[PDB]
Amino acid sequence: DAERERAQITLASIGDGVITADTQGGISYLNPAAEQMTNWTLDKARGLPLASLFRIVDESEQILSGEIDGGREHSKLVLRHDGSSVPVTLVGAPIHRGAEITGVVLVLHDMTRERQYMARLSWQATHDALTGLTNRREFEYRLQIALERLERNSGRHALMFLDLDQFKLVNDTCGHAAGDELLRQVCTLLQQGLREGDTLARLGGDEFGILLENCPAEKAVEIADHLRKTIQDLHFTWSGQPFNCTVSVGLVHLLPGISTLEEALRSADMACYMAKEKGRNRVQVFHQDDVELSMRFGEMTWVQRIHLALEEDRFSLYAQPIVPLGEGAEEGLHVELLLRLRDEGGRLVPPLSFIPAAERYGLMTLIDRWVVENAFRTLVERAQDPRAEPIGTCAINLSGATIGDESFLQFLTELFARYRIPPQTICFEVTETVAVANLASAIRFINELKDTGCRFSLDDFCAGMSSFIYLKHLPVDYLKIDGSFVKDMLEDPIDRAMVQVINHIGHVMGKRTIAEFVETVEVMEALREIGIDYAQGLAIGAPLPFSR
Amino acid sequence: DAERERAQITLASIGDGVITADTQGGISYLNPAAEQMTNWTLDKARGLPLASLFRIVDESEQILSGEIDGGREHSKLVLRHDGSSVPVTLVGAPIHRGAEITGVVLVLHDMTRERQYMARLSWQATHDALTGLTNRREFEYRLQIALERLERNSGRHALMFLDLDQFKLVNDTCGHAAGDELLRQVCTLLQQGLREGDTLARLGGDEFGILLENCPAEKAVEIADHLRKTIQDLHFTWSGQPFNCTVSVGLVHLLPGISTLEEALRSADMACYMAKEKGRNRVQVFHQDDVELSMRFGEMTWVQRIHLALEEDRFSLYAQPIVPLGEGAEEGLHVELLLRLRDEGGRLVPPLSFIPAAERYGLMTLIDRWVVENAFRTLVERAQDPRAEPIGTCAINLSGATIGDESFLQFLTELFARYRIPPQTICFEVTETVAVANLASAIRFINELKDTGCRFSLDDFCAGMSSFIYLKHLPVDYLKIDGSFVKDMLEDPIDRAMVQVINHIGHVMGKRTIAEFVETVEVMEALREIGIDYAQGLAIGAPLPFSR
Ligand SMILES: Nc1nc2c(ncn2[C@@H]2O[C@H](COP(=O)(O)OP(=O)(O)OP(=O)(O)O)[C@@H](O)[C@H]2O)c(=O)[nH]1
Ligand SMILES: Nc1nc2c(ncn2[C@@H]2O[C@H](COP(=O)(O)OP(=O)(O)OP(=O)(O)O)[C@@H](O)[C@H]2O)c(=O)[nH]1
Ligand SMILES: [Mg+2]
Ligand SMILES: [Mg+2]
Structure with missing residues (x-):
């Protein structure tokens, strides 16, 4: 034919x-x-x-x-x-x-x-690979342009930061695949809600950026509350299971030629954070005094709260085991240390109720110094018993404030001399996010600590050419697969593939792999067949009290 | 139907x-x-x-x-x-x-x-995107494995480093597209020449890595010389124009369980370098004493050669202009400083005749300190004339040895106080290669210098998600497109596209773009239409004497 x-x-x-x-x-x-x-x-x-x-x-x-x-x-x-x-x-x-x-x-x-593929590379460099929207790079470029432009800068602009509420819930409950769908669905609604000329981007995580150039103050807030409402009305469901999707919006009214890019970004951040600190599912319009006095108040409140807890011995440490999947491997006991805070009544305080605030107000060095000191202190107390299961690896998570802290190494050196804990026994942990956010300092920190004889692990590890390139520069011993990938490994073919790639390239780059959220032996056996070195989760062992 | x-x-x-x-x-x-x-x-x-x-x-x-x-x-x-x-x-x-x-x-x-695309990401992370062969990551992994493996480690292994001779010739003469073809053609010959089990990789640049596991000493050298011969017999041609392709081979006989990975890599490097230093188109079998004594001798020879030249005022500086392509832009005079060395007779010494040796033997800090001192010194002498064309930007290239040098900033501070050259007037240059090779130090160096008030440029810039990710961390003012992309911009659609992408994403990331090798006004007008901020080449101005 x-x-x-x-x-x-x-x-x-x-x-x-x-x-x-x-x-x-x-x-x-x-x-x-x-x-x-x-x-x-x-x-x-x-x-x-x-x-x-x-x-x-x-x-x-x-x-x-x-x-x-x-x-x-x-x-x-x-x-x-x-x-x-x-x-x-x-x-x-x-x-x-x-x-x-x-x-x-x-x-x-x-x-x-x-x-x-030149058009593909160019697209990639200016857009989020998941959501398809513009990325932080393109957004900050467009935002800068809106302010610096010689032409079309008649009126005022509107910067919005929309952050999804309890987005970790969706990922830790269903897995990474579910969270990506929600992000893609949140994306389509914010797309439908905005007009041509308006710039919409995924700025990272569950955070979106919206720019409304030459749009009045009253119009700007009206759009924000409407978008907030449309996400509230989103009936998100994952394989039958429904989720209540909600968003915390931070709005800033901008001036082209006066207000700088970093001032604009920081203002939208404080307003978004304030809508969260004020109970979530809210739009917080930034006001230079009214929505700034609460940042000074919040700093004062948290300095008092973190110091009181420390002074009142309400912070405690828990230990969760990490075990080898390799057939024939015995090793010493491997535990990961986890922080817990009890309130004035004596009941456990959720992590999101103080870590975001302590991180925001620079109180993380305090907590990291307490964690490390009380971990070494516990290890000495635990060693008084000869019968005791000796700990070969004790993993401690450090914040970005610590990675950048010049005085941490002298403090760690002092701690080593005081508690005589072998450096080799300690494994410091940093998230992929924290490492990249402070890249030159992370590299400097990891190498200084490795020279002391400590081990290092890279947490919440995603796979990509970017993350694997960052890995060349970060001399860590272990690589820890983000739990969200492990959660639906056996139900989603892409998350199974992700686990396999994180493993192979992690092994290629001389790293030992760890899988978290291994809640069942079916997941454990799957990871073993793949080749994963270590498993952590409720099928291995639950977090048990470590400190007294 | x-x-x-x-x-x-x-x-x-x-x-x-x-x-x-x-x-x-x-x-x-x-x-x-x-x-x-x-x-x-x-x-x-x-x-x-x-x-x-x-x-x-x-x-x-x-x-x-x-x-x-x-x-x-x-x-x-x-x-x-x-x-x-x-x-x-x-x-x-x-x-x-x-x-x-x-x-x-x-x-x-x-x-x-x-x-x-998980299989695609995985492939990419273990293979060169151009040549298709395994990358440095996969090769070093396979090499380590060959040495550390418990099983199949009966005999000896053979590490080879094959580096193409005058490969820059092909790129600066025809352009990047031509050099990629030659690399792909060199790849096919080394593919045909090796047997199943043998590992062949592009380790970067025009350098290939070959591993022959469980292959005798005499067999190992025999294969190397044959591969050397097959590249010599390669009649490479680019759009009629023929090129004499030749390779410098460095061979090492390995021992599994004794010889370490870094010892193996360094040994193949000295032997490959020695085959170059010994005249190119040669196989240099590494011998722990015989092919090590020449490294101590070569260090002695070059320490004397670089110091004599410095003492004898045979090093000089040339200046090449950089001009704005933007219609309406005037600015101060922009020049890029270039080093030149004259021998004992008084005739110019080619760059490959001393920079590879000075770089190998750590003599680059010396030269960079002489360049910077004599640039500032010249700028004072030049300023004695009021009529003189004032220099608004004077670009100086710094080596990896300088980027990592802790004492450079005090020396630069001292130079500033002595010659009173405004820091703003100076633009330090580092190649994408040098920055990534010393990533944490480059970031630290660029920021310290920017605080002093100096500008910074990133040289020989390639486009990719890797290079654009590295660019987020490197706070440079200018981005300089590698000349090889500009050379055949108007003849090759991918090189034209490369220039366009380097420009767009460079502008996105707040950088000002520079194009080098603009040898004709046709290339200049093409770059202007695209949007390039600055042009450098023989259509703009040739390198003229700067220093006295
Ligand atoms: N599926 C998926 N998850 C992501 C991606 N990027 C980041 N995440 C996850 O998104 C979550 C972001 O957590 P947060 O916003 O800090 O916390 P939250 O649970 O939303 O709580 P709030 O403080 O109310 O915002 C983490 O669990 C990340 O691992 C992505 O591209 N896909
Ligand atoms: N086309 C192309 N050129 C590349 C690529 N990677 C690096 N290059 C170029 O390859 C050249 C490498 O130069 P060298 O090996 O140091 O110098 P050479 O001219 O070969 O001289 P020798 O010292 O004899 O090796 C430079 O011009 C690089 O810009 C690539 O993927 N494609
Ligand atoms: Mg959130
Ligand atoms: Mg070469």
Whole structure:
């Protein structure tokens, strides 16, 4: 028929190598990308078997009909025995007549070409890969421009910071895949709610940035409260399970030519934080005095609260085990230390009820110094018993305020001399987020501590070319997979794949891998098969009191 | 016909959204990816015009028939007026009957899906994006494994470092595109030359790594000299123009369980460097004494050579102008300082004849201290004339040895007090390579110097998600496009695109862009249209004597 002409132009427009072959291997179709990949033209390869022209090997075939579908991409090579190797990502699907398997369709994507996608790189550098919206880079650029521009700067602009409430709930409850969907759904609503000219970005985490150029004060607040309402009305559900999605909005009225970029960003931050501190699901319009006096008050309140607790011995330490998944590995006892705070009545205070405030008001060095001192102190008390399970690894999480703290090493040195805890026994922890936020200091800190003889771990680790590049510079011993990826590993094929990639590249880069949120033995066995070195979760052991 | 069944399964296996429409817009085909992208099924969209179902807008159509082909990818959005926006990279080709334009074929790739390609990320993290071979990460991993492995460690291994000779020649002569082809061609020969089990990687630049596990000493050297010969016999040509490709090989015989990874890498480096220092196109087998005594001798030779030159006033400084491309921009005179060395006879010494040796033997701090001192000294002498063209920017290149030098800032402070040159007038330069090689120190150095009031530039800048991520951490004022990209900008569509992306993302990140190797006004006008802030090259001004 004349359909061949239509299909051939479509098949030739596709940049990916398309190969169609009969059930027995004989070639039926090769598009120009397949021809260039295999070094064989269709006219010289038609009817001839696949294996006799080129090889689709691995790194040292009929499986497609069985189980190796086109759902997932498979890393193969194209060994052509002339011009040799071409690295691909294969996808295969059977060809049917109607319950009669007649052939095979192969979609082959050339890994060498990825470097040539200039529009893709450019897009990526200015947009969030998940949500599709502009990123922090592009947003801050557009915000700066709105203020510095010579033209079209007649009226005032409106900066908004919209942060999702209890977004960690969604991730720790269902997993990372669920949280990504919610983010994508939150994205579509804020898209529908804004007009052309308005700039909407994901600034990181569950935080979005909205810019309304040349829009009045009353109009600006009206839009914010409406967007707040539309997210409140979002009936988000994950595999039946419904979630109450809510947002905390921080609004700032801007002036082009007067108000600086860093002043604008910081003002929207205090207002967003204040809407949270004021109970969540609220819009907090920044006022230079009215919404600033509460920051001075909040600092005073928390200085008193953190110091009282410390003085009143209400902070305590818990220990959760980390165990080797490797068959034959014994080692010393590995525990991760976790902080707990009890109020004046004597009941446990949730983490979000004081860590965000202590972090905001620079009270984290205090707590980290108390944690480290009382961990070493406990280890001495625990050692008084000879029968006691000796701790080979005691992991402690440090904040960004500590990573940057010049006086921490002298304090740690002093602590070592006082409690005689071997440095080797201690494993300091920093999140991927905290490390990158203070990159030059993190590198400097990790190396100084490693010289002392301490180990280091990188927490809440995501996979990407960025995170793996940051990993080259961060000399940590362990890599800890974010729990959200482990939570639905066995239910979501991308989260399972994420775990596998974090593991492989983590092993490639000389790191030992740890999986958190291993709540069942099914998850434990899955991680063991993959190759994960350590497991932590409710299937391993629950957090138990450590300190007295 | 029954061809529809064959084509539909192929079209459904493609992950990219395929849209086929008539010349007048009416839809003919949508694959499941196109249906999911546009929110419209083919059964409910067949015959109906494109524009009336969804919109393929931009960020604020018939052009395809004219000029906007499927050769280059175009960044568009898919505004569907229901579930709103989907960010794509469009490619379009006309549909013919035979010189009769009947319709249009659109290949739409969803930018949101890029995050889900796990096999692609994993491949990327373990392989060079250009050459397709394993990267430094994977190679060092495999090398470590060869040494640390409990099993299959019977015999000895062979580490090889193959570095292309005068590879900068190919790039500065033809451009980056030519050099990439040569690298890809060098890759295919080393592929054909090695057997299954042998590990071949691009370790960076024009340097390749080869590992021959459980291969005798005599066999190991035999393979190296053969590979050296096959590259010598490579008749490389770029658009008619032939190039004599040659390689300098450094070989090390390894022992699993004794010889460490860093000892192995360093030994292959000294042997490769020695084959270069010994005249290039040679294989230098590392010998612990015989090929180590020459490193002590070479250090002695160069300490004497660099100090003599300094003592004998044979080092001089040249100045090359940098000019604004922006229409209306005047500014002060911008010059880039370049070092030159004259031998004992009085004739100019090529850069490769002393900078590789001075860099190898730690003599770069010396030269950088002489350059900076004599630049400030010249600026005072030049200022004695009131008529003199005042220099608003004087750019000086600093080495990795300087970026890491703790005593440089006190020396610079002293120089400032002695020659009273305004810090603002000085622009320090570091290559992307040097910055990343010493990342924590570069960041620390750039910020300390910026506080003094100096400007900073990032040289030989490549584009990628890695380089743009490194750029977030490096607070430089200017970004300098690598000349190799500018050389064939007007002849190669990818190098033109590279220039455009380096520019856009450089402007996004608050940097001012500079293009080097602007040898013609055609290149100058091209860069001006793109948006480049500054131009440097033989169309602007040639390097002229600066120092006396
Ligand atoms: N699924 C997913 N989760 C992410 C992503 N980026 C960050 N997160 C998670 O988002 C959460 C952000 O937590 P927070 O905003 O600090 O805390 P919260 O639970 O929302 O509580 P509030 O203080 O009320 O904001 C963490 O659990 C992160 O691991 C992403 O791209 N995808
Ligand atoms: N086209 C291209 N050029 C690259 C790439 N990576 C690095 N280069 C260039 O490769 C060159 C490496 O130069 P060198 O090896 O130090 O110098 P050389 O000219 O080969 O001289 P020798 O000292 O004999 O090795 C520089 O011009 C780099 O800019 C790449 O991926 N593609
Ligand atoms: Mg939140
Ligand atoms: Mg070279």
